[PDB]
Amino acid sequence: PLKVEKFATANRGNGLRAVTPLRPGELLFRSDPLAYTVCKGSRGVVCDRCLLGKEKLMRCSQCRVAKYCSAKCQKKAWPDHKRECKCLKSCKPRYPPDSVRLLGRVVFKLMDGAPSESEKLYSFYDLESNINKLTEDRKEGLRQLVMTFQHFMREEIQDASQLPPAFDLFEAFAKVICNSFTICNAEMQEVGVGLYPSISLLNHSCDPNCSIVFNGPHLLLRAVRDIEVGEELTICYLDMLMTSEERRKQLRDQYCFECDCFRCQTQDKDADMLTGDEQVWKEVQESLKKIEELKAHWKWEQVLAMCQAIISSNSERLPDINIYQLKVLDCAMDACINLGLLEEALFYGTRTMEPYRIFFPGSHPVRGVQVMKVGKLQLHQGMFPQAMKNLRLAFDIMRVTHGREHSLIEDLILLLEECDANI
Numbered sequence: 001p002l003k004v005e006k007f008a009t010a011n012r013g014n015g016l017r018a019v020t021p022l023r024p025g026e027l028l029f030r031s032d033p034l035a036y037t038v039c040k041g042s043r044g045v046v047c048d049r050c051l052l053g054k055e056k057l058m059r060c061s062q063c064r065v066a067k068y069c070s071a072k073c074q075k076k077a078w079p080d081h082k083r084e085c086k087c088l089k090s091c092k093p094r095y096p097p098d099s100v101r102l103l104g105r106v107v108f109k110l111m112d113g114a115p116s117e118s119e120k121l122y123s124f125y126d127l128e129s130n131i132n133k134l135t136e137d138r139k140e141g142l143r144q145l146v147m148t149f150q151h152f153m154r155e156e157i158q159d160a161s162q163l164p165p166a167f168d169l170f171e172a173f174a175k176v177i178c179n180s181f182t183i184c185n186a187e188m189q190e191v192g193v194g195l196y197p198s199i200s201l202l203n204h205s206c207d208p209n210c211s212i213v214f215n216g217p218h219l220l221l222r223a224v225r226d227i228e229v230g231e232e233l234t235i236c237y238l239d240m241l242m243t244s245e246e247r248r249k250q251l252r253d254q255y256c257f258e259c260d261c262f263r264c265q266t267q268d269k270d271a272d273m274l275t276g277d278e279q280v281w282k283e284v285q286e287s288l289k290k291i292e293e294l295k296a297h298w299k300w301e302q303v304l305a306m307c308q309a310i311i312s313s314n315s316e317r318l319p320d321i322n323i324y325q326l327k328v329l330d331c332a333m334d335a336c337i338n339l340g341l342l343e344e345a346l347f348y349g350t351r352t353m354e355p356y357r358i359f360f361p362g363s364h365p366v367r368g369v370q371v372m373k374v375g376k377l378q379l380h381q382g383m384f385p386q387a388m389k390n391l392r393l394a395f396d397i398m399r400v401t402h403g404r405e406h407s408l409i410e411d412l413i414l415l416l417e418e419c420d421a422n423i
């Protein structure tokens with residue numbers, strides 16, 4: 001029996017609402033993707049199927065584009081890769097945009113696969129497209145995506161007979177724009193993109209009552225506040241380290257709606273997020289585009305070099321509560337962790353702790369993972385009482401946001417017992 005249900009909202013299209021009272025941490029829905037693929041920066045870095053990292057990946061011999069962590073992953077992924085393999089091969093060395101490879105797997109899954117469990121509450125055909133709200137510039141971009149799809153898929157799709165009935169590629173890409181799920185690994189690094197049509201019923205809130213976490217390509221939807229019967233379920237579509245101005249632009253450009261919530265009306269936390277000299281965090285925000293680009297490609301040495309030039313600059317510096325300064329600290333922490341610079345990683349990580357408590361209120365999986373990384377670093381140093389405090393705080397958050405069904409919770413339990421035995 002489902003604890004959620006689809007309903008027609010008053011002004012947000014369709015949505016999800018509770019059929020029973022919900023408590024923080026309660027599992028509401030589980031879903032594998034209808035279709036998913038590794039994102040551009042993690043291609044060749046994580047396994048195409050399980051989205052886990054590895055030093056040595058084996059490649060598909062036919063296309064040499066798909067890469068896997070094991071023979072089990074390569075063989076199990078063959079049915080959903082067989083038809084895209086001929087297309088990736090014949091289009092070498094041109095790799096398509098992530099959304100184009102995603103839509104190709106949607107078509108193959110819809111044409112050759114049994115009805116997907118991911119479409120139980122809501123199908124790909126049901127997905128919102130926002131067609132009558134798209135700007136002319138957006139339409140032109142979609143038309144280029146359509147022609148990109150036709151060029152990349154010509155080996156396997158020649159006409160509409162190879163597409164599902166009444167399938168419009170323009171409308172399909174419009175659905176992808178506002179229904180794609182960025183997939184992050186356990187360490188909160190973006191590794192993939194997928195479509196989860198039942199989950200696509202969740203509308204947005206800048207202060208939501210639900211939250212999702214990814215365990216590989218598997219999606220877990222949990223409540224993070226108390227929810228009563230009939231109350232709409234909401235998740236936050238956006239990164240928490242954004243101003244209401246930045247939220248307005250992305251919700252307009254990507255999702256075609258204006259947010260009326262209390263946070264956007266009052267510019268909640270905007271002033272604290274932009275403390276420090278404006279000229280400085282304008283330049284830091286500029287450098288962040290290259291920093292986050294390099295991190296998306298796992299170039300940790302180059303990330304750390306750019307972050308140190310900001311964190312330990314000779315010129316004017318920013319408070320750690322400034323979001324762009326905070327983002328540089330987070331990038332520098334993750335770089336040092338992957339480079340084995342654990343003392344320097346703890347220094348940056350501990351500095352993010354108080355701003356993260358402010359900007360990730362309640363139970364948020366991003367803060368839970370961040371607190372776990374800091375506690376794990378402190379445990380390796382021998383700072384046992386400080387490590388336990390954070391590891392228990394991480395568990396307080398992640399028992400709500402991740403739950404028993406997420407494997408990272410098992411990793412945290414092992415850290416908790418090892419450091420508890422230490423104390």
Ligand SMILES: CCCOC(=O)N1CCN(C(=O)c2ccc3cc4c(nc3c2)C[C@H](CN)CC4)[C@@H](C)C1
Nearest residue numbers: 178179180181182183184188189190212235236237
């Ligand atoms: C139909 C679209 C649904 O709405 C959305 O786009 N969401 C709602 C649900 N979600 C997540 O929980 C979600 C999934 C992966 C994430 C990976 C990272 C971060 N945060 C994430 C949030 C923040 C980190 C900050 N360094 C970077 C890594 C995303 C897919 C966005």
Ligand SMILES: C[S@@+](CC[C@H](N)C(=O)[O-])C[C@H]1O[C@@H](n2cnc3c(N)ncnc32)[C@H](O)[C@@H]1O
Nearest residue numbers: 012013014128178200201202203204255256257
């Ligand atoms: C992932 S879908 C959510 C479900 C959608 N309402 C539907 O009927 O399929 C995202 C779309 O829902 C609408 N939406 C989401 N959150 C909203 C909100 N807070 N206010 C108004 N519309 C919203 C926007 O049109 C957005 O493009």
Ligand SMILES: [Zn+2]
Nearest residue numbers: 047050069073
């Ligand atoms: Zn794998």
Ligand SMILES: [Zn+2]
Nearest residue numbers: 060062063085
């Ligand atoms: Zn292949």
Ligand SMILES: [Zn+2]
Nearest residue numbers: 206259261264
């Ligand atoms: Zn809002």
